[PDB]
Swiss-Prot record:
Part of the whole protein covered: 2579 to 2836 of 4485
Family of the protein in this entry: Belongs to the dynein heavy chain family.
Function: Force generating protein of eukaryotic cilia and flagella. Produces force towards the minus ends of microtubules. Dynein has ATPase activity; the force-producing power stroke is thought to occur on release of ADP.
Name the record gives this protein: Dynein gamma chain, flagellar outer arm
Amino-acid positions noted as binding ATP in the UniProt annotation, renumbered to this chain: 224-231
Gene giving rise to this polypeptide: ODA2
Subunit record text: Consists of at least 3 heavy chains (alpha, beta and gamma), 2 intermediate chains and 8 light chains.
Entry domain remark: Dynein heavy chains probably consist of an N-terminal stem (which binds cargo and interacts with other dynein components), and the head or motor domain. The motor contains six tandemly-linked AAA domains in the head, which form a ring. A stalk-like structure (formed by two of the coiled coil domains) protrudes between AAA 4 and AAA 5 and terminates in a microtubule-binding site. A seventh domain may also contribute to this ring; it is not clear whether the N-terminus or the C-terminus forms this extra domain.
Cellular localisation: Cell projection, Cilium, Flagellum; Cytoplasm, Cytoskeleton, Flagellum axoneme
Length: 258
């Protein structure tokens, strides 16, 4: 209903549908299969699949459903190649969002290294290939080089925002320099918050997911060991992406009630 009936209220998906509808069953073909292989997890009780999973993987692609054809804008009206036929951007949305929702519940890294290949080989048959920089691996529908605080991110604004999710700028250092630019001055203005966070690949990966949850009535639940300063990454993604975290102090209930 919303996958294709909203491909007419926004005509920038009016004709990509010519392969897009091939995925709505296909993801279920993944989903149900994934629904039975890692679901039985006596290790930790956090393996379940119901309307939350499909709904969230669809609400993720919704904000890119108001986005444009191939680039952040693209040619914006033409379909002969990676627009209607396998786009990369279409394959992008699917593989990106599924990797965001159908892999990150896992703990075993190797289990994810098999899950992603299962996802790849599922869609492998339904089509032939994709535009590489539109699936720039791992497909970066980036929402930190696109999404953060308003008056933002000079880039072609014909998406419902300046832009919130596009894999065209897949360069990792390009993503990294932006967070340095934001964080350094955002610290310089925030005195006790002047704490600086170390940078590496996982730093790149995780803050995009944090902001993705920030771009919807989405709520977070991160599970991970200490010795990482999880509060640092959290409060960094907090204000840089727009909204302001509100500090907490507690010794009784009426405190937080007020």
């Amino acid at each position: 209903k919303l996958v294709e009936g909203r491909f007419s209220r926004d005509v920038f998906c009016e004709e990509v549908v010519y392969v897009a509808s091939k995925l709505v069953p296909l993801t279920i073909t993944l989903w149900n299969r994934i629904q039975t292989k890692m679901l039985p997890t006596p290790a930790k009780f956090h393996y379940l699949f119901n309307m939350r999973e499909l709904s969230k993987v669809f609400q993720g692609v919704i904000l890119a459903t108001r986005d444009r054809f191939n680039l952040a804008a693209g040619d914006s009206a033409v379909f002969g190649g990676n627009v209607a036929s396998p786009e990369g951007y279409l394959l992008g949305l699917w593989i990106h969002e599924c990797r965001r929702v159908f892999s990150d519940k896992l703990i075993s890294y190797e289990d994810k290294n098999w899950v992603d290949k299962a996802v790849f080989d599922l869609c492998r048959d339904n089509f032939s290939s994709d535009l590489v920089k539109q699936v720039e691996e791992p497909i970066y529908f980036v929402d930190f080089l696109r999404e953060p605080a308003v008056m933002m991110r000079p880039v072609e604004i014909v998406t419902p925002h300046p832009s919130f999710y596009y894999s065209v700028p897949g360069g990792l250092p390009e993503v990294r320099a932006r967070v340095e630019g934001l964080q350094r001055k955002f610290n310089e203005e925030s005195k006790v918050m002047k704490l600086e966070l170390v940078l590496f690949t996982d730093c790149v990966t995780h803050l995009m997911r944090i902001t993705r949850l920030l771009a919807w009535p989405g709520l977070g639940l991160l599970v991970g060991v200490g010795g990482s300063g999880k509060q640092s990454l959290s409060r960094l993604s907090a204000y840089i992406a727009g909204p302001t975290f509100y500090i907490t102090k507690t010794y009784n209930v009426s405190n937080l009630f007020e």
